[PDB]
Amino acid sequence: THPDISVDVLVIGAGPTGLGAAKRLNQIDGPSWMIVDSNETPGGLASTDVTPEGFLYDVGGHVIFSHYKYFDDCLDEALPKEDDWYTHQRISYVRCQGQWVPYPFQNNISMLPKEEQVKCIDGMIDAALEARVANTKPKTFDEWIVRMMGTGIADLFMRPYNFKVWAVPTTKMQCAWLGEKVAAPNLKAVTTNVILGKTAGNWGPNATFRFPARGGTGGIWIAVANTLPKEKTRFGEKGKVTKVNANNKTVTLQDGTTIGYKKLVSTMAVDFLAEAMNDQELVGLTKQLFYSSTHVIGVGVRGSRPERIGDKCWLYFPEDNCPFYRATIFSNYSPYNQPEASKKLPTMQLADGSRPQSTEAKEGPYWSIMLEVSESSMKPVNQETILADCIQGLVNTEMLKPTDEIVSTYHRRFDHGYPTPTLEREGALTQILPKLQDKDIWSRGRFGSWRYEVGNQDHSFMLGVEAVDNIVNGAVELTLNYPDFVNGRQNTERRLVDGAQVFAKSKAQLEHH
Amino acid sequence: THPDISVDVLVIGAGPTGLGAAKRLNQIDGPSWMIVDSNETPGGLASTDVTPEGFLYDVGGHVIFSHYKYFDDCLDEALPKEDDWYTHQRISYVRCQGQWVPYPFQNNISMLPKEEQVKCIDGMIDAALEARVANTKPKTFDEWIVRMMGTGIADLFMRPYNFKVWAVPTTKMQCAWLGEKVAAPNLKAVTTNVILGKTAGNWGPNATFRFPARGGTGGIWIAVANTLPKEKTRFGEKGKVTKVNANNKTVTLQDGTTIGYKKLVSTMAVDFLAEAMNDQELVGLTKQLFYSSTHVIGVGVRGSRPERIGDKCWLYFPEDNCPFYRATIFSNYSPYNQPEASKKLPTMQLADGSRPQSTEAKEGPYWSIMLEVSESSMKPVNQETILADCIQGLVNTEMLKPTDEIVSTYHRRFDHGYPTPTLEREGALTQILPKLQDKDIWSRGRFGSWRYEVGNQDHSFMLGVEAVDNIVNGAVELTLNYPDFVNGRQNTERRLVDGAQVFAKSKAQLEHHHHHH
Numbered sequence A: 001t002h003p004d005i006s007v008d009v010l011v012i013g014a015g016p017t018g019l020g021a022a023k024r025l026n027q028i029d030g031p032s033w034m035i036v037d038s039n040e041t042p043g044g045l046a047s048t049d050v051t052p053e054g055f056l057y058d059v060g061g062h063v064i065f066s067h068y069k070y071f072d073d074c075l076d077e078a079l080p081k082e083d084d085w086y087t088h089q090r091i092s093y094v095r096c097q098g099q100w101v102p103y104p105f106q107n108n109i110s111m112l113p114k115e116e117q118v119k120c121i122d123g124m125i126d127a128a129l130e131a132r133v134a135n136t137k138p139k140t141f142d143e144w145i146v147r148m149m150g151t152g153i154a155d156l157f158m159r160p161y162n163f164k165v166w167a168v169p170t171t172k173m174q175c176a177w178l179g180e181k182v183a184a185p186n187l188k189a190v191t192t193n194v195i196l197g198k199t200a201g202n203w204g205p206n207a208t209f210r211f212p213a214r215g216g217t218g219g220i221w222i223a224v225a226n227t228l229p230k231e232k233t234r235f236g237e238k239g240k241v242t243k244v245n246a247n248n249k250t251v252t253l254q255d256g257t258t259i260g261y262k263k264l265v266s267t268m269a270v271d272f273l274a275e276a277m278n279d280q281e282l283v284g285l286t287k288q289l290f291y292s293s294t295h296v297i298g299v300g301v302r303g304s305r306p307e308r309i310g311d312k313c314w315l316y317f318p319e320d321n322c323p324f325y326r327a328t329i330f331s332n333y334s335p336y337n338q339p340e341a342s343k344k345l346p347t348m349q350l351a352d353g354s355r356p357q358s359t360e361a362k363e364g365p366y367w368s369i370m371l372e373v374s375e376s377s378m379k380p381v382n383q384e385t386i387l388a389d390c391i392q393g394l395v396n397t398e399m400l401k402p403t404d405e406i407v408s409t410y411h412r413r414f415d416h417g418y419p420t421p422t423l424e425r426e427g428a429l430t431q432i433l434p435k436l437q438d439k440d441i442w443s444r445g446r447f448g449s450w451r452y453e454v455g456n457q458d459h460s461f462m463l464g465v466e467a468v469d470n471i472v473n474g475a476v477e478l479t480l481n482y483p484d485f486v487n488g489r490q491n492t493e494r495r496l497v498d499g500a501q502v503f504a505k506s507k508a509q510l511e512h513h
Numbered sequence B: 001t002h003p004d005i006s007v008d009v010l011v012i013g014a015g016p017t018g019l020g021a022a023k024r025l026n027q028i029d030g031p032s033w034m035i036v037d038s039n040e041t042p043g044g045l046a047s048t049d050v051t052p053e054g055f056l057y058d059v060g061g062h063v064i065f066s067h068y069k070y071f072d073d074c075l076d077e078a079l080p081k082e083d084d085w086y087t088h089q090r091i092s093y094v095r096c097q098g099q100w101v102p103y104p105f106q107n108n109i110s111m112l113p114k115e116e117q118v119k120c121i122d123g124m125i126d127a128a129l130e131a132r133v134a135n136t137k138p139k140t141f142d143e144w145i146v147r148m149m150g151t152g153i154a155d156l157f158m159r160p161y162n163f164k165v166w167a168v169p170t171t172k173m174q175c176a177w178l179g180e181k182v183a184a185p186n187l188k189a190v191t192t193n194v195i196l197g198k199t200a201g202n203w204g205p206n207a208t209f210r211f212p213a214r215g216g217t218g219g220i221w222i223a224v225a226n227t228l229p230k231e232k233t234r235f236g237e238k239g240k241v242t243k244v245n246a247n248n249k250t251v252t253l254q255d256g257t258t259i260g261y262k263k264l265v266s267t268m269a270v271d272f273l274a275e276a277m278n279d280q281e282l283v284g285l286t287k288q289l290f291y292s293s294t295h296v297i298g299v300g301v302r303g304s305r306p307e308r309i310g311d312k313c314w315l316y317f318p319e320d321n322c323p324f325y326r327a328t329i330f331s332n333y334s335p336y337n338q339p340e341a342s343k344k345l346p347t348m349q350l351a352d353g354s355r356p357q358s359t360e361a362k363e364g365p366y367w368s369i370m371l372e373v374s375e376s377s378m379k380p381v382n383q384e385t386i387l388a389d390c391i392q393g394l395v396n397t398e399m400l401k402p403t404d405e406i407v408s409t410y411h412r413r414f415d416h417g418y419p420t421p422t423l424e425r426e427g428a429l430t431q432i433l434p435k436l437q438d439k440d441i442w443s444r445g446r447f448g449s450w451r452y453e454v455g456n457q458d459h460s461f462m463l464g465v466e467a468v469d470n471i472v473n474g475a476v477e478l479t480l481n482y483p484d485f486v487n488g489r490q491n492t493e494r495r496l497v498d499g500a501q502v503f504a505k506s507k508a509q510l511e512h513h514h515h516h517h
């Protein structure tokens, strides 16, 4: 029997990947298409939440730096006003030995204690010499670190930090993923800086970036979904996929509505997708994949931005005097990520945990802190005591004075946080993905295609764009198969207005010869 | 005043590049478009000539091996019948020291004389030992050859050969072009074969290949062209481009016709383009480029295929006992490249140059050899003497016995043969190309983009295809900018029937279900 609805291309999920698919679909305006999502609000893991007090929090804070001109076009289309954005320059430091070491760490050894600087340079020297002779390739992430950083920097930062964020040890991850993620320190550069006492903080695709004035990052994706025809969307309890029948190519929803498709773009976690397909083979395969969970903790504090905090953006915490691995001064991204000074709110408690001097509803201004803590089957965290643990950790790292007035807290656990680049991931994905494509299912996204190298808003978005382009125009999926290619170049060819539209438009008015 | 004709995309040239452009444009069926060529027969350098005796000759004995499904799709549409193609294994040797060394030369040291083998291995060892330690990249082509084969092979084969074909010293060429062209020998593999006396002729994309049954490669591009809407073509005198006005985006033709365009795909020699544009800056930039001319020599000889010839395909001649650098037994590719054994022809002359015993029309069968001689400002050739030179060369190399009966001769000089991969090349192209792209001009092709790495029918064809995909869909031009990426992978995404066509075909199937119902 024929399904309730029938389209050429069905997109499941409405995070960056899903809307990516939809934008290109909408642009081509060829094949019939439909996008569904179990959430009444688009944006997925790039959404913003608001506290009863009025503090916005992303999912661990988010930064926008595009490798793609198409991604830029779409953003400009949803927020065209020039006061819809704020442009920032990256100010990132690392909390080490009681000091703020400018990011990247491996280029600012200069800031460390002399005693430690000697440890690090001794390692880079040993490392640099072996590299001058090596011909083989690093097997594990750990081997990589040791070869590029030396044992010194590895024990002082790399190792302990990488466990803190990945929730797994360095020896158990691959190293084919760290192209533009982990900087390989140059011996000449590093020493020079140690001598002169200068800093190197320009490295990375993070240098400069822009943030949305209003709504957090989630505001972006709401604005993006608004440019799509509503009738082709279906968001909420009515859009939740409960069953996927690959063989007869139909999708059942929560309210039992069935959708027929020729091509499926699926952005949901691939392990859930396997369940929905009731496919025992793919189920075995997807459970070879490993992932960590993410707690996001938000704290709202009264008072003008402290001078010790300054223009700091996101900070790193390798040391063990706090659960979180990274921290963001979310209040610096936009003056609308917390209430205005006039808004009155009662202090809930002080930073040390003691009750506040006065519980009356006082005025701001306020500022905001965002923290991320990882959790996995190798690194457990107590969910009930983590919120306190973080505020304690904020004191231990001198992020907060014991006397600082806390006027808002935020805690949420995202079961699927990071797609872990383990040593088995590829062996498992090179099976899963092609098999799904043989069924005409393009499984894409942070958890759709499970590749951290290219997990990220712009990447995820383009994953959805290129899947549609592959399906329709025979494009090559560069971003999915060749991360180091799309990452090392300016991707400017594909625009929100290509020839195909400019041409059909002059064929409308037309005539002339 | 507006032009006589206007299109969204204008394609100049009906070689493999332009025909590539045309195929994709026809497949998309979106923007209006047109293709012009100054020749009545599509194909360009990939076409075929016939002797008044009935011998076919390509422009160098071309061979079809593809890195793209799209290229395959299009040829299959052109020549669908299965008796339209012959498939051949690559039987290729190098002539050295009176021996036939199997290609690739640097992997078959076994067949050389022992004394020569010694020089070659010694070089590989000294080269291998330095390769183990290198951290820099070779500057010139010569530095590359020494690093990867040693002084031995360098002096015996590479150096002399490469000049003989490029018409320039290796020291003047860059080395970023030889990804899949020049094999880098593996010391362990090489010595092993020297010991065991084994051969290794599987290397290269040339291993296996197919050849058209009829019309030579020329027949392919004729067939492919007949798949295009004729009214959108203009081949011959009426299609020769004389002038290009990049400012008001208009091309002028031989007969005075003017064509307006929104996007220009030019496959003509980029230097000719610069001249046609009357742009002084570009002309100055394109005369920094270098190229070599090619002479093609065709010989039709009477008799059964000599047992000394065998199933050989093409042969390399690094030595100086002959003017040509390469030779193909063109008659092995297809039985239709020469007249049938029952057609009677008079012997023109014997190989040694003497007059034939008899001058009556005798029968076949026949076979055919095709030769290539390179020419340049550093390597002149005497155009009036080259033919006899080649014939004489064939005798010196034992290709023809002085008594062989030559029944047909052929000679043609192509001014633009190879785009030379010189050291100054990229310095010139990295200006020329973007500058032209800023005028909405996609210059693409063997001499359109001037990159040997990515010259070759399938490469040229796809250069034309990805340009259109760039102009219309926003694709990235991979072949043009990233030769080693497209060369080292299977290109299966872009098809002659893409989704777009399927869904437009379903959407009109749905609008038919409501027409009557």
Ligand SMILES: Cc1cc2c(cc1C)N(C[C@H](O)[C@H](O)[C@H](O)COP(=O)(O)OP(=O)(O)OC[C@H]1O[C@@H](n3cnc4c(N)ncnc43)[C@H](O)[C@@H]1O)c1[nH]c(=O)[nH]c(=O)c1N2
Pocket: A012, A013, A014, A015, A016, A017, A018, A036, A037, A038, A039, A042, A043, A044, A045, A046, A059, A060, A061, A062, A063, A064, A065, A239, A240, A241, A242, A267, A268, A269, A294, A372, A416, A417, A418, A444, A445, A446, A447, A448, A455, A456, A457, A458, A460
């Ligand atoms: C902690 C942390 C930190 C960062 C980031 C990630 C994380 C978690 N990101 C990356 C980012 O959040 C990510 O790439 C996108 O959110 C991924 O989009 P996806 O669409 O692939 O998944 P995502 O999860 O976002 O979307 C999936 C969606 O599909 C839906 N869905 C699932 N199952 C469904 C079903 N059965 N039926 C209907 N709908 C269903 C979900 O509800 C949702 O709408 C980021 N990026 C960046 O650029 N800069 C950064 O700094 C960071 N930092």
Ligand SMILES: Cc1cc2c(cc1C)N(C[C@H](O)[C@H](O)[C@H](O)COP(=O)(O)OP(=O)(O)OC[C@H]1O[C@@H](n3cnc4c(N)ncnc43)[C@H](O)[C@@H]1O)c1[nH]c(=O)[nH]c(=O)c1N2
Pocket: B012, B013, B014, B015, B016, B017, B018, B036, B037, B038, B039, B042, B043, B044, B045, B046, B059, B060, B061, B062, B063, B064, B065, B239, B240, B241, B242, B267, B268, B269, B294, B372, B416, B417, B418, B444, B445, B446, B447, B448, B455, B456, B457, B458, B460
């Ligand atoms: C000696 C030799 C040997 C080989 C090969 C070439 C050569 C020279 N090739 C490569 C191959 O022949 C090549 O890549 C294509 O023929 C290049 O086609 P283009 O379109 O780029 O130029 P090409 O010259 O082929 O075509 C361009 C065209 O534009 C036209 N034109 C020029 N000016 C014009 C004007 N003003 N107005 C209109 N039209 C104009 C020309 O007349 C022609 O029709 C090959 N390939 C392969 O894969 N296997 C092989 O074995 C070989 N070997």
Ligand SMILES: O=c1ccn([C@@H]2O[C@H](COP(=O)(O)OP(=O)(O)O)[C@@H](O)[C@H]2O)c(=O)[nH]1
Pocket: A094, A103, A104, A105, A106, A162, A165, A181, A182, A183, A316
């Ligand atoms: O000072 C630093 C901080 C980060 N890292 C490495 O860089 C990777 C990516 O950092 P990023 O902040 O970009 O990852 P995110 O969590 O934001 O996606 C981490 O896994 C670390 O291994 C580093 O080399 N030096």
Ligand SMILES: O=c1ccn([C@@H]2O[C@H](COP(=O)(O)OP(=O)(O)O)[C@@H](O)[C@H]2O)c(=O)[nH]1
Pocket: B094, B103, B104, B105, B106, B162, B165, B181, B182, B183, B316
């Ligand atoms: O035995 C051989 C024959 C070829 N060459 C190299 O391969 C290149 C290309 O040869 P090919 O016949 O493939 O070029 P074509 O003329 O067919 O494009 C030449 O420049 C030589 O440097 C080589 O390394 N060994």
